Amino acid sequence: NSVPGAPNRVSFAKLREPLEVPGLLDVQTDSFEWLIGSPRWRESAAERGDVNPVGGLEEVLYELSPIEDFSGSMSLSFSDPRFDDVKAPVDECKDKDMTYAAPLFVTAEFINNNTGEIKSQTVFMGDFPMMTEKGTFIINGTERVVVSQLVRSPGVYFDETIDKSTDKTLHSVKVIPSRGAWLEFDVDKRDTVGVRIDRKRRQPVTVLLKALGWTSEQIVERFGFSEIMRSTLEKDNTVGTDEALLDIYRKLRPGEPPTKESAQTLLENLFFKEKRYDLARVGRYKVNKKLGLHVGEPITSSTLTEEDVVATIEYLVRLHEGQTTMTVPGGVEVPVETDDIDHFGNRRLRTVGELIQNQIRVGMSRMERVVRERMTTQDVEAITPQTLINIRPVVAAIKEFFGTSQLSQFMDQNNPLSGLTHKRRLSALGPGGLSRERAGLEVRDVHPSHYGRMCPIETPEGPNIGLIGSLSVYARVNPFGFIETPYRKVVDGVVSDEIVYLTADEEDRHVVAQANSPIDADGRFVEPRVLVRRKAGEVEYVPSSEVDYMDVSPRQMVSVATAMIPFLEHDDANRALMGANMQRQAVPLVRSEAPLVGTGMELRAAIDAGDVVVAEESGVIEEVSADYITVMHDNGTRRTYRMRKFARSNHGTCANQCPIVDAGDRVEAGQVIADGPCTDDGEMALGKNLLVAIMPWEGHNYEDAIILSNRLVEEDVLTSIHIEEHEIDARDTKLGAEEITRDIPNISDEVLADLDERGIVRIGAEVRDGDILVGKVTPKGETELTPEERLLRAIFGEKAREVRDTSLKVPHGESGKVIGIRVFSREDEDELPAGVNELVRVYVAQKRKISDGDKLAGRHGNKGVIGKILPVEDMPFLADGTPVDIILNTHGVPRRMNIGQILETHLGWCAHSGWKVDAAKGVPDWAARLPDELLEAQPNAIVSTPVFDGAQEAELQGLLSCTLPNRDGDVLVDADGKAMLFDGRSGEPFPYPVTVGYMYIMKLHHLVDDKIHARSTGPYSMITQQPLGGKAQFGGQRFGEMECWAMQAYGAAYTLQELLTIKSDDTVGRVKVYEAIVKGENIPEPGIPESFKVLLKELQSLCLNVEVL
Amino acid sequence: TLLQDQLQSVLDTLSEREAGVVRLRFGLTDGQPRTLDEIGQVYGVTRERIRQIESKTMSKLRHPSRSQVLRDYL
Amino acid sequence: PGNRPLKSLSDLLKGKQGRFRQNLLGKRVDYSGRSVIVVGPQLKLHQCG
DSSP: OOOTTOOOOBOOOOSOOSSOOOOGGGHHHHHHHHHHTOHHHHHHHHSSSOSSOOOSOTTHHHHHOSOOOSSSOEEEEOOOOOOOOOOSOSHHHHHHOSOOEEOOEEOOEEEESSSOOOEEOOEEOOOEEOOOTTSOOOGGGTOOOOOOBEEOOOSOOEEOOEETTTTEEOOEEOOOOSSSOOBOEEBOSSSOBOOOBTTOOOOOGGGTHHHHSOOHHHHHHHHSSOOHHHHHHHHTOOOTHHHHHHHHHHHHSSSOOOOTTTTTHHHHHHHSOTTTOOOOHHHHHHHHHHHTOSOSOOOOSOOOOHHHHHHHHHHHHHHTTOOOOOOOSSSOOOOOOOOOSSSSTTOEEOOTTTHHHHHHHHHHHHHHHHHHHHHHHSOSSSOOSSSSOOOTHHHHTTHHHHTTOTTSOOOOBTBHHHHHHHTTOEEOBSSSSBBTTBOOGGGTOOOSSOTTTSOSSOOOOSTTTTSEEOOOSSOEEOTTSOEEOOOOOOOSSSOOOOOOOOOSTGGGGSOBOOSSOOEETTTEESSSOEEEOOTTOOOEEEOSSOOSBOOSSSOOSSOTTTTTOSOGGGBOHHHHHHHHHHHHTOOOOSSOOOOSSOOSHHHHHHGGGOOSEEOOSSOEEEEEEBTEEEEEOSSSOOOOEEOOOSOOOTTSOOOOOOOOSOTTOBOOTTSBEEOOSSOBTTBOOOOOOOOOBOOOOSSSSSTTOOBBOSTHHHHOOSOOBOOOOEEEEEEBOSSOBOEEOSOOSSOOSTTTTTSBTTBSOOSSOOOOSSOBOOOEEOOOOOOOOOTHHHHHHHHHTOOOOOSOOOOOBOOSSOOOOOOOOOOOOTTTTOOOSTTEEEEEEEOOOOBOOOOSEEEEEOSSSOEEEEEBOOOSSSSOBOTTSOBOSBOOOOSTTTTSOBGGGTHHHHHHHHHHHOEEOOOTTSOOTTSSSTTGGGSEEOSSOOBOOOSSOOOOTHHHHHHHHSOOOOTTSOOOSOTTSEEOOBOSSSOOOOSSOEEBOOOOOBOOSOSHHHHOBOOSOOOBOSSSOOBOOSSSSOOOOOOOHHHHHHHHHHOOOTTHHHHHHHHHHOHHHHHHHHHHHHHOSSOOOOOOOGGGGTTHHHHHTTTOOOOOO | OTTHHHHHHHTTSSOSTHHHHHHGGGTTTTSOOOOHHHHHTTTOOOHHHHHHHHHHHHHHHHSSHHHHTTGGGO | OTTOOOOOTTOTTSSTTOHHHHHTTOOOOSOOOBOOOOOOSSOBTBOOO
16 A cells, blocks of 8 residues: 555455554664754654754753853853755765765854953864765765664662572662762661762761761651661761761772862762763653652753662662652652663663764864863963864764774675665674673573564574664654554553554553454454463463553564564574575575565565665656656656666675666656666565475485576576776885886786786776786886896896886686776875875676575575586476476475475465466355455466465465466366476376475575685795785685594694694795605605794793703 | 706707806806906907807807797796 | 883793694695585595585
């Protein structure tokens, strides 16, 4: 529905969602946006209530600004928070290699304090990181990608703690103010007070409490019952806040004349210093959140308060003791209890500006924390709002930040969603964040909540799962890093047709209704009783009659990627998420196809590619051609909207962007306009709805073995091309520099008879390996040779030159046609790194025509190598001739799970083949229901279904029974799954019926050349001359130690030894036997651990002398 | 040295004097070039007499089979 | 500078670079036959891809 270019992949909606697809993607941006704070977002936020939100900026400004000296006589302030505007299709930078950005102006204002005066100055600030419609930032035509680090909400937090000693429940809580130090109270073993602050032994609190002014009375009074503390007033022995205080204070420093400071100053400072003591408003906010506190209090500050301090303290006491709720004076009550890290309300998440903002923050700070410095020194008088500016270091970082911004991580432009996934991708680790070398599984741990939060399934994978992820599906997330699941907030067998974005918490209080659930068409789930998670998410049954809220659909904590394959309910999650991640590693070959089957996700998902040239106006078409297309913006109005092609990925792939229609036709904004990449008929082309079947065969689909057609070739089905950029600079240095001529020493002809006038050939030109390349050259040196030579040269007049004959030449597995020409000169002004005056970068096609053996696959994780190629003929094949797509061993699924593969595929041939319900007279019962409408399948046509919703077996099965028998109204197929092809070879019948079908799959960014290597020899650590592994190099595989042990298990000695010597780095035998070799002869028998020799020396060295004899 | 001595071999593919003649012609023999009178000095003749036969036997070897016999040494 | 303390006598076969440790470590060397694989029904012991 709601789809301009809509077809219909007819699905199986047994259900309904009034709700509809959010926009995801939005995300950050918005932030950014908000961070910015556009009168957009401004409007945005602005709407949906929202008092006085603020572009993540200001703030900045005001969180410091305005300004002033320490002399209290020069007053600066700010203003004009804002920017200018970019200067490119970005696309420009893209090509133009720089990054995309737009200038910043802002208008602070200094003011004397003496006279007090005026120094505004709408100062420029910075051209700036300018996002993308992809909501992104492709530094210098080059973007990484940032995800947010999950972050359990900071704050003073609570628990019981037992002591096997006595087992007593020394509960407690910390304090953790942003940037504010620490200080914590803790159910003492023996009486009483988990006093000490951010690591200071312990005290009698009140010494601090009283220390601020507290008659031991006042407490006991308000705090005698409240007896354990009474002990505190006991052992507290010492008195006089001050007496303490100062004494404390020593407890602080320690050792120092307790000046009144000791009596207060820093103390307050310490944590009454929003000057520096600076928790988090949201926390701040929290806080109240903690405890129905001031609450009625649109507040904001680091305003520490002994007030609440003690408050929650006696909270402690009251609890350790067991006590439900209770209301502090005024402060409405709170049911007592510890806390949790685990749950997610415990647990916010970060976001750009936020970051940024932090970054930046110090940035100014920094750069800021200077004018101060200078402010002063910067004599009064003529010292303009300018005079003292220099954000430079800011962007320096900032800018920089990206450099280092390890979390910005180059968008794997391998497929769309893949890139997506990358988007929504989410963890909580790294810079300042965790260091997996320190985190208990729990980190990875499951837990209830979780639903409607992030794909249960997917995750990292190596030592990595339970560490990272994304969102679930819908539920937006807090203006403060917390999900926003709306719900079927039910009402009296009549759910309240109503979103309710929810932070798990709260909520937690509430009643877990069930999607997939039969209402009396009214909310009135027709049963009296139901189930539902409870306090512990206690997925508990119950009488329908009682919940507050149901849900928002089925399937939600899901991921998109998650959201992708049915039969789940039959299939290994392991295997699953496996396929999940898998999913991505398709490889947009060429053909473009969609599984005739597949849910709705799909392009409606894919649309969220938001990539395809896609309508902008109900305009009629206009001129068209594969670069763009003029667009009759029917307001007269037009715009030859463009279209890209032949431009590499992060992974070597075109810019292709295939059209749709006709320069004359007529259509309307937002509707499609032209695919391109992973973009089958407006849709991730992703595989091949492909026959094949069931046998494990002649041992070739065995142990992962895999048996594969061939026609394929021919068919071509399997290829695209791939892209290196091809670079090689012209440099500058000692003996001269790095020329790029075309002349060359005793170079072959043609070898040159090929390049351009002065080096490399010309675009779209074919090659191979070795193939020389550049037109480079460099001075050689100056250190004589043997007369012998020269002489020799005199002998052959080959009057040698003297220049470091230098250039480039094609390595291995390499060919195609000329492309790149990023020949960019320093000298030609083309800014570039030192000692260089230019550089080109180039590209070449190569259509990868799919080797067998390799690996592909599709849904049901159901990965699959690519064993053998196999000619057509020679092939089991329709009794109607037509043979397989390939075949399939058995076995795994059993010990695996994923049989939908089976079903789905049944299905496959089905759809692929269509049918019609011959319900006629009446009803296929199992029919008697369901998307009726179908009734049939026009042999082969569009077919989707819901996730946790779709027809059934029997049905499905019975669907089997159903049919669109072929030409000869035939169905070699059995209402059964197993027919009986014969042999494209020997040919005869088979033993028994033949299970078979079809399956779209996908193809792999992982094969030989990805990893096709060894190494005969090459470079060698100018230090530990080991195989200098490298590009030019094959690396030359390293070796293991066990291994060695293996030897041992034999003792080939030598062998190993040898190694150690040889290929290890036997300078000699390397040379030496290398010779031998060269001379092929009873090899220079293994010598001596040489070096080892060193040792000795090495020893001696320390008076160490000794010896064997 | 495959070269080198391989040469030396070639260095014998003709006559005699022409050695120190030429070996000396760059001290090749003794590792140090010289002068027509420097060497031929020994034979007592003329820088004339020297480089005459000299470059001549060059021609000898300037000949190709004189070469390819050591050409890949190129 | 960078208060980088400095390598002592001492070190050497001391620290990870224990020429000790040294040996016991495997390493990279020439002619590294490493790649994926398949069987080859047509098989005979000794045989191989």
